[PDB]
Amino acid sequence: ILGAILGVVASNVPLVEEHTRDVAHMDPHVLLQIFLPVLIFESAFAMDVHTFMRSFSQVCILALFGLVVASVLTAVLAMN
Amino acid sequence: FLQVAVAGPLWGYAVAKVTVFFLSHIFNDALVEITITLAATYLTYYIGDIWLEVSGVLAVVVLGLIVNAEKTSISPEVEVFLHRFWEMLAYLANTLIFMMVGVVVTQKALVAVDKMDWFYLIILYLAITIIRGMVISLFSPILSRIGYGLTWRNAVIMT
Amino acid sequence: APKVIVFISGSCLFGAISRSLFKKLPIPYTVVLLILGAILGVVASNVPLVEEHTRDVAHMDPHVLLQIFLPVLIFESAFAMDVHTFMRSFSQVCILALFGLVVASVLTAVLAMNLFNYNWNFSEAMMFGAIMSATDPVAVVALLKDLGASKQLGTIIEGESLLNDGCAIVIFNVFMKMVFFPQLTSTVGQNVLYFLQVAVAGPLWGYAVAKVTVFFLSHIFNDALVEITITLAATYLTYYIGDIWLEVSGVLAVVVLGLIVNAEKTSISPEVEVFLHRFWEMLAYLANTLIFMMVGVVVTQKALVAVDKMDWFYLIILYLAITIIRGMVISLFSPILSRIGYGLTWRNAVIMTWGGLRGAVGLALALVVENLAGNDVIGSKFLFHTAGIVVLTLVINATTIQTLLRILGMSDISIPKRLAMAGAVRRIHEGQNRTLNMLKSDRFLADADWDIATAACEISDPYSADELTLGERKSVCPGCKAMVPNEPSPREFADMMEEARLRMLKAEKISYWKQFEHGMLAREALRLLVQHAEVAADEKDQFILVDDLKKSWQIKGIYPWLKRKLEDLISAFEVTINIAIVLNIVPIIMEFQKIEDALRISNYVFFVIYAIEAIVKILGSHWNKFDAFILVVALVDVVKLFRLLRGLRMLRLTKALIPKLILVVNGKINNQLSLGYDVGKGYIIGEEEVGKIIDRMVDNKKILRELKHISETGRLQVVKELGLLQREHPGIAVSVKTRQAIRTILNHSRETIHELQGAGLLDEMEAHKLELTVEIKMKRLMNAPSSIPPPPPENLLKNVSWLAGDMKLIDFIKARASLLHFDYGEVIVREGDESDGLFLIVSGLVKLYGKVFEDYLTVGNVIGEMGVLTKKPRNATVTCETTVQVYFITAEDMNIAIDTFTLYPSLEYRLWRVVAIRIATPLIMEQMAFQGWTQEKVKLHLERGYLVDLAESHFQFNIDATLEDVILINGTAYNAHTREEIRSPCLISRTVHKLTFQYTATEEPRLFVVRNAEPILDGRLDVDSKRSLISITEISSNMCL
Amino acid sequence: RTLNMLKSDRFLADADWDIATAACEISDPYSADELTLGERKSVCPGCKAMVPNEPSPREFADMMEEARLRM
Amino acid sequence: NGKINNQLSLGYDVGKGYIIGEEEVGKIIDRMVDNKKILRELKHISETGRLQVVKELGLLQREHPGIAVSVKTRQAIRTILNHSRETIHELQGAGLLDEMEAHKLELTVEIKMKRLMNAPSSIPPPPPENLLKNVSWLAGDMKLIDFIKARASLLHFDY
Amino acid sequence: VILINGTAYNAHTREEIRSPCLISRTVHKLTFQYTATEEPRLFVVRNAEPILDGRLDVDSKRSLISITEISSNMCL
């Protein structure tokens, strides 16, 4: 909500337009290469790995195959 | 497909073993261990995604799981520092992503939106919840016959 | 695809390799980082992919380099400082850093102009001197902290380095604006205004944002990441807004902000505090590694293409002249710097001269000069000379400063430190041998390879005229190792007196450390106490004097005068009119189109003339008299229209802002009085402990009597001084005593939480929840009212220990009390009068004097309890020192109250419990002194006990194994052996099987026992209305199957 | 116990103890079940219930289950 | 050998935890259990479980000798270093050692613990001559060690 | 106090210590007796016990200077 308020202020005011233009209109690859390693490494590092590996088969089959079939179903839903 | 789905985790495993071996032989300097962890994460993702043309996300997944598995190779003060440091780094990344997303949504994405698009958003939310529930319900006969089966309450909470 | 990630992560890997491989070598890792940067730069000059990466990173913008790397380095230099020792020598560090930096920059500019063949003018040479003068010693500070004493020299060096870096970047920015980026002319008044703006509004902006950051950090509970991001964003926003938006020196702002945040570390949670220390250290390490790698790459790519043998000769002469100039600066300011509280010797001057290590700050300034100069040769010469001076200073000064600290005699380990380390190593070796002998006979770990175990568990001694001094120190001790009877000599008596004084001072230091580690003392009070102890130990055969301790709680200064003046100044409607004041204020800022909407309709008709003057002050002082002056000036209601609002706003806001200044002054007096109270309590508890352990240490009776006499005179003087300090400022003393009481209760509750966690009775998550609760309570205690008003004398009767919960007894005692007012009467209690009632002190400080026991009791202490309970003539004469107000409950009323209220725990039982605790603390403290018990631990162990009801025992008592200590309070008792009934109150010897009390003339001798502390814990709940208040009632832990 | 110790201290004796007891007030975070607790309280006739008796086979089974739970 | 070392360390820790827990719960069972018949039954089943786990751990020692010797050496070094750290904290808290010197000794024992973390996981079993040298009732007396070693008799009982 | 193998008489000598067990803390004194040769061992653990004066000695090369006689039991 605060980002939306700052964005409409930047759409009105030119100095906030300068700041959010230089930052929010960023390159995609630099956005991935900066923000994805931090989030992915913290998600992997905050895990309790003993209880994760004790139920690794169930988590693996659920995440992998449920993600595949949910992506397929969402694609069919979007197309239809 | 073989290159991505195999050499992602293999590259992550290799750099994770190298990082664990490097962290095991460091004594009485915390900052070396913290910078080794940070540079190992960023170099793993960059070299995997760009130089080796492989899935760098699975490499960081495998590297983080192995480093969290071998927490005994890190000193305990460095261990609790690394926990709080990666927590605040993820907090920084989430805050920056949400602020940038709000700015670009109300600057660019909100100029082309109709009442049909809002209706599609509502039906998309309902169908996403229904699809996730159907996925968990269809995989529930498989997921029940493991060492930790799913009840209906756990399935509802996961949905 | 950003190559900056490759260069940053490669620089981190190279820094890790440099730190790991150069642990043992005396060469710093920054020099080999520069060498690796040069190798990477020539590889990039050959190979095009490394050229791509180092082109995208090392050829960076100057302003982004400053705005990224300078706040981190400056904030870590300010935050790693020990701010108490920095502010104790702030004048010397300030004059040395400021004036020595100015004169060294001037001398380096003159040297550059006269020596260098490049035709630099005075502004470019002053930029060169500003870059060269900035010193960043970290290895010197680490070596001075590691090598025992001269910690104050290390703090002087670190504070001078921080202020020198800040002022160097300030004068560098001034002369860089004079040379490169503008060339604009200005008048003398604009130059004066610019100098005033920079050198004043830098620290003022830093102070303002630091106060805002501290106020924001004080009100954050149970989220660390918010505090860490608040610190980081405050630092970066302070530097950016100061440097860019306000056009002010942002470096001094970050210096002031870091010093204030390091000063108020109590507003941060301790886990967040240690995280912030390690996090800012890591950030400064990252910034240093990146700066050194980038500097090496750009030096070997751009700065090394224009360099001659004359330039190398100029580099060598520049290094020699820089060292000579710094030595001349320290020598010329040595007469000024000697006459401070910490003067400089010649060895400290030599260490400070040779400790001028050039760091990453000057390298960053040379980088921004070289990028600002463009294709001109001045930036190349600047970068080459700065890199050469950095390399030479790092290598030569680091290695020869280790050698010079060895040579000058400042690195030798002191004899008591060597003794303590050797004793600790011997104790660790004995404990390891006992653990090894225990483990060799274990069930499981019995067939282990014990040669490898003894090789691995081999922690050794770190330390592996003096002979004559040790010979004297060994001939001064003819102790248990040498059983030769003799008689003392006057030279031998003087040596014994000196040795006894040294042992007393050493044991006082041990007591101060014991107070700190369990926690009664603060850090600064402990530092002051051990400083006074070592000062007394060093000089002139004197003990720790009362005057140097008295300098801590002398509250007088600017703050009590300000408090008195503001309290003389003073004597939701007000909130509403203050809201109206601010709502009028913001139109004045908007005023200073339709002529601004008719000047916002004449300021909303002067806000309907201040809401008809707040309905004429809701139909109503001298404050209101000048408010009526503002009223009639508003009745006059374009210079007058502009002036009236500005005169209205501050004059109306003065009444609001005065009590906030009162609260600020009360907070400053609260801090100073807290320090004074902590120093006084530490000295009193240390003197009590060292008096309880002085009979074992001191053998000669005359020296024992002299030491006991001087110790008890010092103790009585400090006790009387603290009582008068309580009498001086009542509300602030009540606030600091309330804060200390809440902190003590919360610390003991946290100890109970850790005890119940470690005993297994509570799991880890629930113990973590309770620890979160008590930590939130402690941090909310940190931000407390510092001027808590004193309780009424009626409320002091409610919160006594011998009547706390019995409301009917409270009503009876409060109804039949008598508040007397003695003024220097000294006729409270006489030596032999009959008992006529109690005396509950509600004000003032009494003085006890009787059999020779001397003490100064205060508010809360009851006088007359022994005489009233035992029906005997009183013990000691109690006098009045400052207008004591007692609560005289008469003897007949006390007898009626004892006979009346007995269905509860009886009033006689409560009074006997209070006097039993008071008479039983010094006996247990005398017996268990050598086992390592403090007075607070002894009192808390005594508080668990209960008086034995002798009706069931029928005057025959048996000592079981459950009872840990038995103390007879009032009278005699026989036993099974019945050798002699015990005449005096004392602790019962634990060998005695039974006690046989006798019926005599009516005393009924009370005995006090403390049973030792005692996993099923079955409890019963009950459901209530709304099905949310379901709670366990009958916790038993004593059930059947 | 800490409050009763601190009320009779040399220094911290005139503090405002109402504010101290208000601040040091760490409370309980948690503020068919009735029949289950009734069984769990009828299974414990312990030191708070001093009634001599003799065991029953249903009582013996309940005592065995309670002893196993306590172990 | 490292993987078997980790699994055998987990098994030894589980067995030692159960044995020490059964010893403690047998020492505190007289107060908790009032009926003598149930007390005797619980003591009997507790002692049978304790004896079975003790025999299983002895056979586990007999299975892999070098790996068991390595994990017992690691546990012994860790126990001695933990008690030395407790002695350091005791000497610090009693005031006899200042904060910087206690920090130096804590740094030394932490460096020793982290070097213990990277240890040979297949330490060979000591010879039977070396087991006579490191007993508790003859440790330092070299002449007594020589006398007992000269006049010993190594027997080879087989069931 | 734990008597390891044998008997001892009390100062009250109500009944001599029959079995190896924890000798009670209430007993003032023990009177071990000479009998058929066992010589009954009693095991005692004394409670643990700040001046700590020690003597060094300078050796060759003036680097191995170390304290030898840590005593903590001296006179003035």
Ligand SMILES: Nc1ncnc2c1ncn2[C@@H]1O[C@@H]2COP(=O)(O)O[C@H]2[C@H]1O
């Ligand atoms: N050594 C002491 N310690 C604490 N309080 C004392 C001591 N001596 C006297 N008092 C107090 O001073 C009072 C003087 O008269 P009482 O003997 O009636 O009761 C006495 C106690 O309350």
